[PDB]
């Protein structure tokens, strides 16, 4: 296994199509700066 990321308030937006059971691949987009 498990990896948990924490980001500061107001700093990133999660990619909007990601939800529970979305496939993850190293290097694919996870979030964007605000």
């Amino acid at each position: 296994x498990t990896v948990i990321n924490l980001f500061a308030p107001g700093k990133v937006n999660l990619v909007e199509q990601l939800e529970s059971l979305s496939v993850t691949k190293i290097g694919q987009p996870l979030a964007v700066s605000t």
Partner: protein
């Protein structure tokens, strides 16, 4: 209140003795038997060996060598927008979204404390109150190394002792504080997007945690919280990693 054999096993089984036993076996150069276990694992969990640098299961001298097998660079291209934070691990999203004050979702309906995840470190909890979280779940079939979502200066690492519960839908729904009570390593970075934590949480059997700067953190299991600090990035003794670069991994033991 819930009457489940499987949930009872989580509490009954000597999870640590099993983790030690498997770590012992996974470190053995056992030739044909090593290769057999790897082939059976690859078959049963549908591993894509095409993605590995060494796709041949005979190339691995121990099971752990195989479990931590590297991939081909080309097969995980790092997004190039410097405004894009990338996935740290192959697997599935377990949960993600807003940290509701101190509250993180472990499963639909089931919360846990940011302070509890961070072992009572209220000053590190304050950095992330009302922030954002992502929980990635890595399975036996997945690549077992973990990479940077962005450029970071390492500031803080905390080893936290704990249990080695399994991680699945039953434990995520039925074991309170699953990720806040399981053995784990908390890494805190300065980034362009402010402070960022990348926490590596172990599970039954897959109990061993490494970082690239400190090697194997566990085992052995010494029962105490350990804290390390590093200076700001402008200073001698600082540690710096790039977006997409390896920062740690998991293995058996």
């Amino acid at each position: 209140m819930l009457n489940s054999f499987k949930l009872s096993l989580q509490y009954i089984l000597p999870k640590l003795w099993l983790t030690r036993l498997a770590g012992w076996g996974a470190s053995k150069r056992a030739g044909w038997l090593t290769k057999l276990v790897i082939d059976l694992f690859v078959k049963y969990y549908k591993v894509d060996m095409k993605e590995a640098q060494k796709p041949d299961t005979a190339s691995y001298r121990t099971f752990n060598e195989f479990f931590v097998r590297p991939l081909r660079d080309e097969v995980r291209p790092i997004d190039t927008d410097p405004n894009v934070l990338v996935m740290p691990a192959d697997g599935v999203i377990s949960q993600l979204g807003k940290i509701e004050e101190d509250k993180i979702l472990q499963a639909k309906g089931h919360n846990y404390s940011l302070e509890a995840l961070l072992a009572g470190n209220y000053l590190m909890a304050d950095l992330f109150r009302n922030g954002t979280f992502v929980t990635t779940y890595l399975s036996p079939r997945d690549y077992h190394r973990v990479h940077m979502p962005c450029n970071g200066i390492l500031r803080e690492m905390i080893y936290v002792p704990g249990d080695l519960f399994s991680v699945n839908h039953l434990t995520a729904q039925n074991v309170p504080n699953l990720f806040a009570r399981n053995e784990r390593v908390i890494c805190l970075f300065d980034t362009e997007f402010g402070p960022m934590a990348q926490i590596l949480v172990g599970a039954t059997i897959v109990g061993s945690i490494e970082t690239v700067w400190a090697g194997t953190i566990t085992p052995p299991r010494e029962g105490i919280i350990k804290r390390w600090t590093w200076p700001a990035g402008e200073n001698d003794g600082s540690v710096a990693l790039l977006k997409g670069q390896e920062m740690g991994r998991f293995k058996l033991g």
